[PDB]
Specification:
This is part of a larger assembly, with three copies of chain A. Chain A is an alpha/beta fold. In chain A, helix 15 (431-440) crosses helix 18. The complex binds 1-deoxynojirimycin (NOJ) (3 copies) and magnesium ion (4 copies). One 1-deoxynojirimycin (NOJ) binds at residues 65-66 of chain B.
Chain lengths: 781, 206, 206
Amino acid sequence: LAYSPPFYPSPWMDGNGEWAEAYRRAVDFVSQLTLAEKVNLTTGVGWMQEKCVGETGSIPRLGFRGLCLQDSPLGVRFADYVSAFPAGVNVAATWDKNLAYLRGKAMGEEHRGKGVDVQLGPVAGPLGRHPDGGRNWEGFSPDPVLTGVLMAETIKGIQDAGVIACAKHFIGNEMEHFRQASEAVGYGFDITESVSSNIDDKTLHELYLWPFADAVRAGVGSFMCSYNQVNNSYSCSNSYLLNKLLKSELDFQGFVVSDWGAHHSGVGAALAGLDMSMPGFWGTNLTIAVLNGTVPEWRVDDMAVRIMAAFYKVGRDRYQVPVNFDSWTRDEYGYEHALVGQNYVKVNDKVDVRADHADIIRQIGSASVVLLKNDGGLPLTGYEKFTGVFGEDAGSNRWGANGCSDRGCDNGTLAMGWGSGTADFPYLVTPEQAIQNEILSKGKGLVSAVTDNGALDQMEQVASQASVSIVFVNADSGEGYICVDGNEGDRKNLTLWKGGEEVIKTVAANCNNTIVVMHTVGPVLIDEWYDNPNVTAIVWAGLPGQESGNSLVDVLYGRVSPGGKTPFTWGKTRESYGAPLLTKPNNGKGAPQDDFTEGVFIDYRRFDKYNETPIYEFGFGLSYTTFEYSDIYVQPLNARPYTPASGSTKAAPTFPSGATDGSPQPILPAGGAPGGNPGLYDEMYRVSAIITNTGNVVGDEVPQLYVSLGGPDDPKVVLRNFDRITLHPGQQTMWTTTLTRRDISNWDPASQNWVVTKYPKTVYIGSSSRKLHLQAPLPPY
Amino acid sequence: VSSNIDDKTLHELYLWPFADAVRAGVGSFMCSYNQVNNSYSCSNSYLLNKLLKSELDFQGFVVSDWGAHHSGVGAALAGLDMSMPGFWGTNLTIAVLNGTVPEWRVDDMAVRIMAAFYKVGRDRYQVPVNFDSWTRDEYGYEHALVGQNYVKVNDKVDVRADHADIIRQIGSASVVLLKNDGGLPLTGYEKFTGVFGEDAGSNRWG
Amino acid sequence: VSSNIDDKTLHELYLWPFADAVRAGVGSFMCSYNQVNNSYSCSNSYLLNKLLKSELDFQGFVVSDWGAHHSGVGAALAGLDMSMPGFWGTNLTIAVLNGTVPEWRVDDMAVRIMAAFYKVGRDRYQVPVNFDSWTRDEYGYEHALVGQNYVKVNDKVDVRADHADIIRQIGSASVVLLKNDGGLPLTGYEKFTGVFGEDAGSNRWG
Ligand SMILES: OC[C@H]1NC[C@H](O)[C@@H](O)[C@@H]1O
Ligand SMILES: OC[C@H]1NC[C@H](O)[C@@H](O)[C@@H]1O
Ligand SMILES: OC[C@H]1NC[C@H](O)[C@@H](O)[C@@H]1O
Ligand SMILES: [Mg+2]
Ligand SMILES: [Mg+2]
Ligand SMILES: [Mg+2]
Ligand SMILES: [Mg+2]
C-alpha cells in the first residue's frame, strides 16, 4: 500500500506580507479568549442545528456570533431571492480572467447580503482526471493553469466583496465513487474506508497541487480538505498533505476546514493540520487534549488565529450582517426552543440580493458558448421562414425550475448539475422561450418546439419543413449522494442523455440546416454525428444558469460572436481519455486504491502523448470572424539565479514525533512565502506575437501560449498563459506575456524543489493546443 | 410524539396483551420509539420499572427499539437492560465505577438477558449464525488484527421444511366471508372465469 | 407494389408449394393484394388462367383477398370466381346478358364454388352459423321487411373438444434446441430458479 510519511509540527502562521494586518488583529482578538472560546471557533455546531450549512461555535461574551459557512461555488445554496450563476466549467470556457473575477464579486455580494462569512468554493479539486467524474463541472478545467488562473480570479472577486472563499476539495477527490464509506454502503458496496488517491510527488506538484498554489497566492482565506485519502491517509488528517505541502511549501496562512463528516483522527487531525471540524465531541476532546498536553496550547492558538485572520483579511468585521435566511426551511417564522418553553421567531427575511446580477450571468452565458462547427449555419437572423426547435433540453422542467431537490434530475433544459454545488433559480429562461421571443420580435416566421425526445414522428414532420432546425441535447452529473438514471454521481457513460443522439440523427435526416446545442457537464462521444453534412453548426453551451436561453440567442442570432474555447478534449472514444473510473472495490473491505498511474497525462496531455487525434482539441473554438497570428518574439530577461529558501520560522507563540514541537523550524527549499518560494514567480522570458482580425465582424480571440519542456516524460505541450481579446475588423494587437521560472520548471522529488531542466524548451503561440501557429526556442541563460 | 394515556386506559386496553405476553413466559420486551406521558418508553421508569417489572413482575430483559432515544446511563436506572443497535458500553462501565449506576443493576441487566437465554434453552439449541443480513454473497472480507480475512458469510441453510403447509392453512383460515348472496363456493366447472385487478397478478420486479 | 418474378423462379420456388396445395385437393385459392409483373393477382390472367388453372389444373374456385383490386367484370374473364368482401353482382349479371361475359364463364364460376362445397361434404356437415364475428352479445337486432326482429346471434358453442392436447404436443415438437452446453434438461429440483423477461409473464390486458 502506497504511503504518506509524517510531517510535524503543524506550521503556525507567519502573518507576513498581505496577511500582516489580518494576523495582527487576529492576535489581538485571540489574546482575549478563554480556551473554551478558542475551541468554539474550531467546532461545528451540528448538522442542521442552526441556519447555515455549517456554523462554528459563538463567543457571546464578546458579542461574536459563530461563522456562517454556506454552499455553493456558483451561488448561495438553500436561499431564496438569489441568482443562479453559470457553472465553473462555463467560466473555464470563457478563458476570461475579468469575467471570472466579476462572477466572484457578484457571488460574494449575494453571500454578503445574506450574512454568509464563508462561501464554500471555488473548486480546483476535482481538477478533471476522469471525463466522467461527477463533479468536474463545479471546477474549471483538467488543465492546471487554466483552472489555477480562473480559480485565483474567482477568489479575488469573492474576497474583494467581503466574504471568505474556501478552496476545495484538497486534494485528489477526482471521482465520487467510494469517496465516503457510508455513501458507498448506501450503494451496496462493502467497504469501511474511503478510496485512496495514490499520487506520486511529481504528479502532485505539476498537476493537482498547482491550482491550489494559485489559490493560496491569491489570498484565499480557507481550504477544505477532501473526503478521500491520499496515499492511504485521509486528507483531513494527512500531515504530509496539510502540514508539509499546504502549510510549509505553499505557506498557507489561512484555515483548513473539513469536508462535512470527512473522517479524521479527532485530536490527531488537529496536530496534522486541520483547524476546523465540520459539521460537528471534537470540542470536548480538544479542550481535554490541551489541558493534558496532548495538544500544545500553541496549536489551538494557531487554529483560532488562522480562522480570525481569514475573517479580518476579507473585512468580515465591516461587512458582517445577521444571517437573514434559513437553509432548512423557506418559512418566514418557526418555533425555537427557549430556556423556558419555546419562542416563535423570524427565520427568513427574504432579503433580495440579486441586484443586477442577471446581466453578468447572461454575459458569462454568451461568453462561454463554444462554436465547434459552422459550415454556414450561424449566425441566424431571426427572419428565417420556419424555425424548428427540438429536444427536451430546449424545454421547461415541468416540476418548476427548482422542482428537483439539489437539481437531482435532468428535466427540461440543463443549466446546472446536481449536489451541493447548486443554488435555486429565481427564474429560468429556456431556449424554447428565448428562441420564440427572438422570432416573434423580428421576422415573425413559423416556429415550433418539439420537446419530447420520444416524439420522433413529430420531429421529422417539423424538421422537413424548417429553414433551420435547432436541436438541444444534454448530459448531466453531480455529487455522489444523488443517483440519477443509474449515474451514481459519476457518469456511467459519455452518452447524450434521453436518446439525444437519436434526436440529432432524426432531425438531420430531415433537415439539411441542422444546428446542435449541447448543454453538457463535460465531453460526450459525438463521433457518429458531428461529421454529418446536414449538421451545419455545433455549439457547446454547458450549464449557463438562470439566463440560459437569452445568453444563447445572443450568440446564435449574432449580437455576440462566439469566443469561448473548449476547456477539455472531445475524444473519439472513452478509451481515448485513458484513466478509467474505478467502480468496483479492489482492496477487499478496505480503502479502494485509485492509482494515478498516468501521471500528468490527463485530457489533452494524454491525447498528445499517445498521438490520438481529438474531434475537438483542448483550447479549440471558432468565431464569426477569422484571426491571423504573426511575428513571435522571445526576449530573455536574465532573471536572478534561483535561490532555495532557507532559514528558520519563529518559535510557536501563545496568545507522533515532532507533533508537540513548538521550537523554530527549518524552511523548506521550495517554500518561504504563500504560493511557494518567491523566486518561482520571477519572469524569465517575455513572449510576444501579433493577432489580427482578418474577417468582417468584431470578435474575440483567445490566443494561447504553450511550452514544450523537452524531456522524454514531459507533455509535448502544456498551457502556460492565455488571454481573451476583442478585435474590430482589420484591427491588430500585440499580445505580450511572461513565463515565470515555475512555468518552465519540473518538480524534482530528490531535492524537493522546482528545477529548470537542461532539455531545450520551445514556446508556442496559437489558437488551440493543436493549432500552434507560432513557435520559437527559449534560449538558456 | 408523546402518547398521553391515562392509567385506567393503559391497564384496560394497551397493557393487557403485554401482561398476557409476560405471563406466557416471553423472554424479552422491546421499548418503543414514542414517549408515554412525555417520557420516552426506554427511559420511562413508570412504564418499565413500575408497570412492566413490578406490577407485571416481568423477569426477562428490556431491549430498546433501534436508536430509541434515552437519557444514556439514566435509561438503565429507569429499567432498560439492553441498548440497540449502538457508544454506551464505556459509559455504563464508568457509571458503575463512579457509583452512579449500582453494581446490582448492571448485574440484574446481565442476569435478565442470560435468564431469557436459558429459559428457551439457547444453550442446547444455539448454532453459529449461518446467514448475513447485509449481503447474499457466500463469502466476504473481514478486517483482522493485521490485513484481512476472507470468510464464509452465507451457508444458504434451508430452514423452510414443510412450513408451506401451515402457511397455506393459515391463509385459508384467515379468509373472512363478509357477503355471500349465492356467489360462493365456485366449482371450477364455470364456463368463463374473469380475473380482474393488479392485486391478482405478479410483482413484475420479482 | 408489383412483385416482379421470372418464370423459372416462380416455378421452382413460389409456385411449388401451391402445386402441392392443388394436388392435396384444396377447394379454394385466394389471390393476393399485390401485383405480379404489373398485373394485380386477382385480374392476372397469366397467373390464374395459365399457371393455376391450366398448368396446375386447379378445379376449385378462386376468391379475392378482401378488397383486392381487380378489373371488375374483366377479372372474371381472367379467372377470378368470387369477389370478397363485396357493385360486382349486377355488373356481372349485365355483362352476361349483353354478352361481355359468356354464359359458360359464370356457369364455371358457380360450379367451381359448388364443386368445392361437395368435395369436402358441406352438404353433410353444414350446420347454422352459430357465432357472430362482430359482437360477443347473445342477442341483437336485425332489420325485418317491416320493423326489426330481435334474434339470437351467438350460441357460444364450445368446439374446443380435446384440442388442448394436440396444441401442447405441437408446442413441444416445435421447440428447437439450438445450443446445449450442460444446461438442459432441468429436473425441477434446482435450489433456485430465476425466470427473467416480460416474455415469461402475463398480458396485463388479458
Ligand atoms: O454541503 C457542504 C459540503 N458537503 C459535501 C461536499 O463535498 C462539499 O463540497 C460541500 O461544501
Ligand atoms: O429492524 C429493527 C427494528 N427497527 C425499528 C422497528 O420499530 C422495530 O420493529 C424493528 O425490530
Ligand atoms: O380477414 C380477411 C382477409 N383480410 C386480408 C388478409 O390478407 C387475408 O389473409 C384475410 O383472410
Ligand atoms: Mg432551525
Ligand atoms: Mg510559514
Ligand atoms: Mg418481582
Ligand atoms: Mg383442365
